[PDB]
Enzyme design. Structure first.
Site, PDB file in Angstrom:
ATOM      1  N   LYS B 164      13.110   6.418  10.183  1.00 57.20           N
ATOM      2  CA  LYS B 164      14.014   6.916   9.154  1.00 57.20           C
ATOM      3  C   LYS B 164      14.075   5.984   7.947  1.00 57.20           C
ATOM      4  O   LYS B 164      14.014   6.438   6.796  1.00 57.20           O
ATOM      5  CB  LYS B 164      15.407   7.111   9.754  1.00 57.20           C
ATOM      6  CG  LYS B 164      16.376   7.859   8.871  1.00 57.20           C
ATOM      7  CD  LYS B 164      17.681   8.121   9.599  1.00 57.20           C
ATOM      8  CE  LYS B 164      18.311   6.831  10.085  1.00 57.20           C
ATOM      9  NZ  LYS B 164      18.927   6.060   8.977  1.00 57.20           N
ATOM     10  N   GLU B 190      29.104   1.014   8.473  1.00 56.36           N
ATOM     11  CA  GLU B 190      27.811   0.407   8.745  1.00 56.36           C
ATOM     12  C   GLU B 190      27.976  -0.855   9.581  1.00 56.36           C
ATOM     13  O   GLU B 190      28.836  -1.691   9.290  1.00 56.36           O
ATOM     14  CB  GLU B 190      27.097   0.078   7.433  1.00 56.36           C
ATOM     15  CG  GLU B 190      25.672  -0.416   7.598  1.00 56.36           C
ATOM     16  CD  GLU B 190      24.672   0.708   7.797  1.00 56.36           C
ATOM     17  OE1 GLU B 190      25.066   1.784   8.294  1.00 56.36           O
ATOM     18  OE2 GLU B 190      23.485   0.512   7.463  1.00 56.36           O
ATOM     19  N   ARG B 191      27.158  -0.982  10.622  1.00 61.31           N
ATOM     20  CA  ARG B 191      27.066  -2.242  11.342  1.00 61.31           C
ATOM     21  C   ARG B 191      26.472  -3.310  10.432  1.00 61.31           C
ATOM     22  O   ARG B 191      25.547  -3.045   9.663  1.00 61.31           O
ATOM     23  CB  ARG B 191      26.210  -2.081  12.594  1.00 61.31           C
ATOM     24  CG  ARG B 191      26.650  -0.972  13.533  1.00 61.31           C
ATOM     25  CD  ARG B 191      25.622  -0.771  14.631  1.00 61.31           C
ATOM     26  NE  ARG B 191      26.088   0.103  15.701  1.00 61.31           N
ATOM     27  CZ  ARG B 191      25.789   1.390  15.803  1.00 61.31           C
ATOM     28  NH1 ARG B 191      25.049   2.001  14.895  1.00 61.31           N
ATOM     29  NH2 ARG B 191      26.245   2.083  16.841  1.00 61.31           N
TER      30      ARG B 191
END
Ligand SMILES: Nc1ncnc2c1ncn2[C@@H]1O[C@H](COP(=O)(O)OP(=O)(O)O)[C@@H](O)[C@H]1O
Ligand SMILES: [Mg+2]
Ligand SMILES: [Mg+2]
Lengths: 361, 464, 548, 79, 78
Positions: B164, B190-191
């Site tokens: 991706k 988001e991590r």
């Protein structure tokens, strides 16, 4: 302005005035006459979802009964389509049932306060006749669910804590206060036929579940039967009558109805295994059960007078004895060789024979 | 004068009391800046956003950071405008947070730059484009089977391990190189580890000079993760309106946006809707997605990653987000296990632009014929693992068609060696039509692997 | 009792004015607290209770209000009065105000910003206001004044060919709309003794609908299906087909995307369908109060034509978004939710709207109003809450499959709303369609006697190929009935199923060339022409046809 | 024959589309003229308001006080 | 058949493009004329607006006051 007028609200008749006895009313419908006959002085209910055939059944019953009654009738329409009432008024005016009928209308477009207190007006109009002239009165109610629905809409703004599924805390009390005035006392009687709506095709909703307890004979319509073309869509196993006793309808009628119900239940038990495996993994008795059950289920359908403008067939009327005879012959394997399609939308069994003959068999 | 004071503190929710007839408008930004007066205090640097007017000169706000250390009675400053972020060419190649302050330790944006408000109404009815256009990505499978639309919405149903972050980089590179556009990436929920990885990947492949980045982390209050997509949106709107470019906007997960909104709604004391969502789910989604349009100047095209809760496609959140989408794109593992890049499913991917009145009649017919052939080949797998007459020819054509959908990318060059190509839509349509007719039936199947136009496969076969 | 004046008034004049207002209002005594505000140099502005009497400076601003001889020499300036209130709460789109003593239920109020609102609840010392517009310019302490009118919209023929919002404000940018009449949004429905049975056909132009699910003028038919089944295309084709028929169409878009609304309007303008169409729009980024009044604005616009003897058709592009907007609005007012969190009057919300469509009697004029609501399902579930709510209000339904599903699509009023020519040929077509539909269920892989092997399969396949159609190409009823008559009478049985579409196109060309008497006889009589002549024409076409 | 008829139909449709475009352009020009006239009227009205305000400020308020009192009494009677 | 249809379509598209270009040229000429008329009417109707402003102030409340008002309006414009 000088005519006599009566208040809408009054208490119910007491315990020392009612009259208890069971007589049978003839409708001309096979699935109703056989498995759930109507009482001549009680309360009858027709449960249904949306678009399954409550109005057509109501109109057929009106056409068959209201003329034969020869007494007085009242029709109250609560929360229904206005064009339906416009059609019914002209149909009655053409047929001539007017001049012995009074109508009250509060319909879909009216505020909740009007839809709440319309059944009480027709109730008062019928009570006058019953309690002052000793007559026999018919009472039709177009949809009794709208009464509780309007009550639920009002109770929220009245400032009350909601009950389950958001309904009002006083559902059962209001329903009982309405439904206990429709009785047969020592002077006259009130035969009430009511159509009840089932929201989202859920029969365990608080309103249908509460109204189930006030009825002597019930008629449940299902969407699955209507999707197969079976009309009317009465469920033959969930519809009940208190007059289906051996001493009331007879002894032959009782046995025929019980055997028909037993075979339909047995066929119902085998649906999943037929769905997955098929018809090739069954015993001979089971195949015979299916063979007769499909024929019975198709022979429970009929062609109505008021449905002629849809299909084209003139319509049919069957007395009780003919229905019992026909189902007795079907159960005996007399007509086991005819195609299963010849049984749909006919009045009697001689018509089944004629339709099979015209089909090339 | 125009000073407020704190009244209540309940976690991420604050109340401020102002003077008579001096209250701030809804959605404004308030600032708390406190220095420890004595040893019993701490330093505070906080930003709050107005949410409700409760009456009696009191305003209820949500916090963008931690509220530990707040004392009732501290001064509050009213800025007079919503959150304003810097816009222009100064935001290309940098990383920001929800407040517009850089978080890449490369300095501060000068105080004399130009800043734009976060909250804005959508463009008017008379300013939209009257026609429907097509965005030429340059990727064969996307351009042929699931075409993109300028000003449209695309749902990416990918995952971890399917490629991706390579497709995203390829889209950025192709758009910037051929059309001159600019890209914005917004990561909601988001991590931190994955954000670090993505930043280093983009710096390695070189696309960082054409893209802006905004991060709203998983460890931020629900108010912060609710207003991150608006910062990327207002960063892209500058290039759309002022310059007139065709801009790309990536949203890392549009589900976390709705989850943060639901948490904020629960914190404010509202009656929950069906399945426990906020009553204003559709209004919030529409206010986000109606600013992504194609006006008479330029266009913003949005690619958004969607997570489906409990594998239920009728859940309120996916059902609400699916009514805005114009196309979908599914990445699947086994297509990567056969060495096919990109691993786009050619039958699960759909688009509403595949109609004869938009792409013409030749493109439409070629696409349908390819789809039918691939469906037949998929059907014949059970039999295959000499069956009939035409099935052998079907399989012979389908292997080549399935292999020709792969491509060599400019961002995989640093790992492979090949230059990478950009294939126009007319060329790919002509190549697929010729393969369907069978003009190239006398070549080995491996020649149809990771090439551009139809001439490169012939050259590969000749040299092999 | 506070006055604003340019100069400090004399105490005697203050006493005289106070006594005059005490006598006028109804108080024995009154005292005025004059101020020294110098901005109002024109004159005196009085504020007593919640009433204001203006000065003269406002007249200059009133001069701008009188932008409009030479303005009748600045016309004349009068002491305008107004009733006001102040805001005490605002958030999520609902306000709450003091003052506004003599306000009515359902009235329209105007904020100092310029936005409008509804007066919903009149409490003991409060008024609940629903804001119809952007609420980020309204703060506690603002001023709101009455308008004196129940909610209403502008109506007339000046609205034809324009794009407006639920309040009648144009959004296409072509200038002001010059109407001169209004109609209330909430109005009663026609009575039982005001209607008549439906006896006229509404021609959509689509063969499957025109033959299997007919629609009459004055009916209420529901179009139901999943997302991505294309019901907007059905609506657009139906609106386009009414070019020759004397019909006025109204298209209402609720919760859609403004880009798709733009392209739909462009499609309508190409086919010349903007000479008789009004478009009302409220996109997905607009407030819930505006998303919920749009159908009522549309019906109010239609009833103006309906009550003059004309015929109208109204399309609601999604009722399932109006329902969600109303649920959102009612949950913010803290009302106990019912099934699926919907309120208790979600049935009333739709039943009060769809009961305004009627076929009026001849004493009332003879007008009509047809309605076509849309509902969107999830995974084709037709037994949900809202779908069953609306199925029990209308006169039929059309179920689109993710292609009409004739097992669930029905029409009650239709059948008497059909011409005799199509009524003669529709029955055979229905029976063939049923025959194929049940036969294919089991005969996918199984040998059958020649009867069920050809007459029960080939005829059905040919009719399924005939029933297909293309976008934005409606068909006249005469051509429709002629092709259906040929198919039911027995031609095409030796034509390959891959050539029926071209057969039909060439048949239409042949008809338009040399079938003028047939077409004119149908159009003039509403009955089938002579069978011998029809068979001769069909035989000539078959002879000239080049079968492939 | 049929092909030439289709060509003529395409030509007629294109001519109708061009005529509609021309009518739209003419209407746009008329709308622009109307908007320009409205804007000129608005500017004239603003200038008139400013000049009238300046003149009224320059005017003597000694009699304007009595005039304001009389107008207030008249408005009291009217309301 | 296909060639004739393509030729007809090409001719129709050329005609449409020519009509649109002619409309654009007419629009440019109309815009220039409208701008010139707007400027000239701005000057003339600005003098008229000053006169009507003097008249409106007098109506709400001769030559010397009009001249003073004109001078004040000129000073405000400057
Ligand atoms: N006895 C019947 N015979 C044939 N069709 C019926 C019958 N009852 C209902 N239907 C079908 O149902 C439709 C009408 O349903 P209706 O009775 O109006 O629903 P509701 O339960 O809301 O009254 C008609 O179109 C008709 O096709
Ligand atoms: Mg009913
Ligand atoms: Mg729709």
């Amino acid at each position: 302005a000088d005519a006599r007028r009566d208040p809408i609200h009054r208490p119910a008749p007491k315990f020392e005035e009612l009259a208890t006895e069971v007589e049978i009313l003839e409708t001309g419908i096979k699935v109703v006459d056989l498995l759930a006959p109507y009482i001549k002085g009680g309360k009858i209910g027709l449960f249904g979802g949306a678009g399954v055939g409550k109005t057509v059944l109501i109109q057929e019953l009106i056409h068959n009964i209201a003329q034969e009654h020869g007494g007085i009738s009242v029709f109250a329409g609560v929360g229904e389509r206005t064009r339906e009432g416009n059609d019914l008024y002209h149909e009655m005016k053409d047929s001539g049932v007017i001049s012995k009928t009074a109508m009250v209308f509060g319909q879909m477009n009216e505020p909740p306060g009007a839809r709440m207190r319309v059944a009480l007006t027709g109730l008062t109009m019928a009570e006058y006749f019953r309690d002052e002239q000793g007559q026999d009165v018919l009472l039709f109610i177009d949809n009794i669910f709208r009464f509780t629905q309007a009550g639920s809409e009002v109770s929220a703004l009245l400032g009350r804590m909601p009950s389950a599924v958001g309904y009002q805390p006083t559902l059962a009390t209001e329903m009982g206060q309405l439904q206990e005035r429709i009785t047969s006392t020592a002077k006259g009687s009130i035969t009430s036929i009511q159509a009840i709506y089932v929201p989202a095709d859920d029969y365990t909703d608080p309103a249908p579940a509460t109204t189930f307890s006030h009825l002597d004979a019930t008629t449940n319509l299902e969407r699955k039967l209507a999707e197969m073309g079976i009309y009317p869509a009465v469920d033959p196993l969930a519809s009940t009558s208190r007059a289906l006793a051996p001493e009331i309808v007879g002894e032959e009628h009782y046995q025929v109805a019980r055997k028909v119900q037993q075979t339909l239940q047995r066929y119902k038990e085998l649906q999943d295994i037929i769905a997955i495996l098929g018809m090739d993994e069954l015993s001979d008795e089971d195949k015979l059960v299916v063979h007769r059950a499909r024929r019975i289920q198709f022979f429970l359908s009929q062609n109505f007078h008021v449905a002629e403008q849809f299909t084209g067939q003139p319509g049919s009327y069957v007395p009780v004895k003919e229905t019992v005879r026909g189902f007795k012959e079907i159960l005996e394997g007399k007509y086991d060789h005819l195609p299963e399609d010849a049984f749909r939308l006919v009045g009697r069994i001689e018509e089944v024979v004629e339709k099979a003959k015209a089909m090339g068999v | 004068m125009t000073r407020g004071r704190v009244i209540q503190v309940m976690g991420p929710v604050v109340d401020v009391k102002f003077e008579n007839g001096h209250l701030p408008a809804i959605y404004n930004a308030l600032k708390i800046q406190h220095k420890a007066r004595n040893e019993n205090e701490v330093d505070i640097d906080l930003t709050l956003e107005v949410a409700l007017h409760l009456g009696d000169d009191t305003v209820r706000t949500i916090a963008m950071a931690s509220t530990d250390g707040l004392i009732r009675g501290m001064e509050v400053i009213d800025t007079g405008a919503p959150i304003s972020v810097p816009v222009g060419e100064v935001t290309l190649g940098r990383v920001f947070n929800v407040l517009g302050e850089p978080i890449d330790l490369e300095g501060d944006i000068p105080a004399d730059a130009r800043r734009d408000p976060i909250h804005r109404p959508a463009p008017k009815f008379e300013e939209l484009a009257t026609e429907v256009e097509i965005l030429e990505t340059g990727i064969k499978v996307v351009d042929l089977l699931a075409p993109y639309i300028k000003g449209g919405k695309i749902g990416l149903f990918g995952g971890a391990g399917v490629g991706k972050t390579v497709l995203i980089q390829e889209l950025i590179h192709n758009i910037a190189q051929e059309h001159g556009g600019i890209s914005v990436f917004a990561g909601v929920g988001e991590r931190t580890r994955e954000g670090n990885d993505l930043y280093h990947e983009m710096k390695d492949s070189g696309v960082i000079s054409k893209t802006a980045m905004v991060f709203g982390q998983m460890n931020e209050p629900p108010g912060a993760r609710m207003r991150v997509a608006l910062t990327g949106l207002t960063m892209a709107e500058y290039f759309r309106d002022e310059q007139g470019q065709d801009v790309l906007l990536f949203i890392d997960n549009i589900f976390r946006f709705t989850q943060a909104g639901s948490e904020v709604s629960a914190l404010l004391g509202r009656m929950p809707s069906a399945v426990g969502y906020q009553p204003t789910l559709a209004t919030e989604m529409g206010q986000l997605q109606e600013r992504i349009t194609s006006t008479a100047k330029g266009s913003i095209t949005s690619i958004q990653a969607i997570y489906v809760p409990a594998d239920d496609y009728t859940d309120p959140a996916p059902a609400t987000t699916f009514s805005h989408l114009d196309a979908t794109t599914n990445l699947e593992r086994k297509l990567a296990e056969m060495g096919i890049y990109p691993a786009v499913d050619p039958l699960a991917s759909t688009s509403r632009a595949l109609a004869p009145e938009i792409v013409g009649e030749e493109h439409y017919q070629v696409a349908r014929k390819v789809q039918q052939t691939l469906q037949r080949y998929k059907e014949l797998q059970d039999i295959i693992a000499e069956l009939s007459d035409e099935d052998k020819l079907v399989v012979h054509r389908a292997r080549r068609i399935q292999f020709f959908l792969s491509q060599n990318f400019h961002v995989a060059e640093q790992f492979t060696g090949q230059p990478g190509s950009y294939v126009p839509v007319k060329e790919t349509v002509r190549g697929f039509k010729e393969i369907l007719e069978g003009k190239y039936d006398h070549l080995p199947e491996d020649a149809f692997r990771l090439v551009g136009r139809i001439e490169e496969v012939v050259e590969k076969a000749k040299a092999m | 009792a506070v006055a604003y004046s340019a100069r400090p008034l004399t105490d005697e004049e203050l006493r005289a004015l106070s006594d005059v207002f005490a006598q006028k209002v109804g108080k024995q005594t009154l005292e005025i607290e004059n101020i020294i505000d110098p901005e109002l140099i024109g004159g005196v502005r009085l504020r007593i209770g919640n009433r204001i009497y203006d000065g003269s400076v406002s007249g200059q601003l009133e001069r701008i209000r009188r932008q409009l001889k030479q303005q009748i020499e600045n016309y004349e300036s009068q002491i305008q009065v107004s009733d006001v209130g102040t805001v005490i709460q605002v958030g999520d789109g609902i306000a709450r105000a003091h003052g506004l003593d003599n306000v009515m239920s359902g009235e329209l109020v105007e904020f100092a910003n310029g936005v409008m609102g509804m007066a919903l609840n009149l409490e003991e010392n409060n008024v609940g206001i629903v804001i119809l517009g952007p609420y980020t310019g309204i703060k506690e302490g603002d001023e709101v004044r009455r308008t004196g009118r129940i909610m209403e919209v502008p109506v007339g023929e000046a609205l034809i060919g324009r794009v407006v919002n639920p309040l009648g404000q144009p959004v296409d940018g072509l200038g002001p709309v010059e109407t001169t009449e209004t109609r209330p949004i909430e109005s009663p429905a026609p009575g039982v003794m005001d209607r008549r049975s439906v006896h006229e056909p509404l021609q959509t132009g689509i063969k499957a609908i025109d033959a299997l699910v007919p629609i009459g003028r004055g009916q209420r038919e529901l179009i139901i299906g999943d997302r991505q089944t294309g019901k907007t295309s059905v609506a657009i084709d139906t609106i386009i087909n009414q070019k020759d028929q004397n019909m006025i169409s109204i298209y209402v878009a609720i919760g859609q995307k403004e880009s798709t609304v733009r392209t739909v309007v462009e499609t309508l303008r190409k086919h010349g369908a903007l000479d008789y169409t009004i478009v009302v729009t409220a996109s997905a980024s607009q407030p819930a109060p505006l998303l919920f009044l749009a159908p009522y604005a549309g019906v109010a616009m239609g009833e103006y034509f309906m009550y003059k003897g004309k015929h109208v058709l109204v399309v609601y592009d999604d009722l399932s978004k109006q329902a969600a907007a109303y649920r959102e609005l009612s949950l913010l007012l803290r009302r106990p939710p019912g099934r699926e969190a919907y309120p208790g009057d979600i049935f009333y919300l739709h039943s009060r709207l769809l009961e305004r469509a009627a076929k009026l009697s001849d004493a009332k004029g003879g007008g009509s109003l047809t309605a076509l609501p849309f509902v969107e399902t999830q995974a084709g579930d037709i037994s949900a809450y809202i779908p069953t709510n609306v199925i029990s209000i209308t006169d039929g339904q059309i179920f689109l499959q993710s292609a009409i599903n004739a097992g669930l699509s029905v029409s009650r009023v239709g059948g008497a709303a059909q011409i005799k020519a199509m009524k003669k040929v529709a029955g055979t077509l229905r029976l063939d369609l049923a025959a194929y539909r049940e036969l294919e269920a089991f005969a996918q892989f199984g040998s059958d006697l020649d009867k069920a092997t050809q007459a029960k399969l080939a005829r059905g396949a040919r009719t399924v190929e005939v029933l297909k159609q293309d976008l934005h190409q409606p068909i006249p009823v005469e051509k429709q009935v002629l092709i259906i008559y040929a198919l039911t009478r027995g031609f095409l049985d030796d034509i390959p199923v891959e050539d029926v579409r071209r057969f039909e196109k060439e048949f239409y060309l042949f008809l338009d060339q040399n079938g003028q008497h047939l077409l004119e006889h149908i159009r003039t009589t509403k009955d089938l022409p002579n069978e011998d002549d029809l068979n001769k024409a069909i035989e000539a076409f078959k002879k000239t046809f080049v079968v492939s | 024959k049929l092909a030439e008829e289709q060509k003529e139909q395409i030509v007629a449709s294109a001519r109708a589309e061009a005529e509609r475009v021309k009518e739209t352009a003419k209407k746009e020009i008329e709308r622009e003229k109307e908007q320009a006239m409205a804007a000129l009227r608005e500017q004239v009205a603003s200038l008139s308001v400013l000049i009238a305000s300046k003149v009224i400020e320059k005017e003597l308020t000694e009699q304007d006080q009595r005039k304001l009192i009389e107008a207030y009494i008249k408005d009291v009677q009217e309301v």
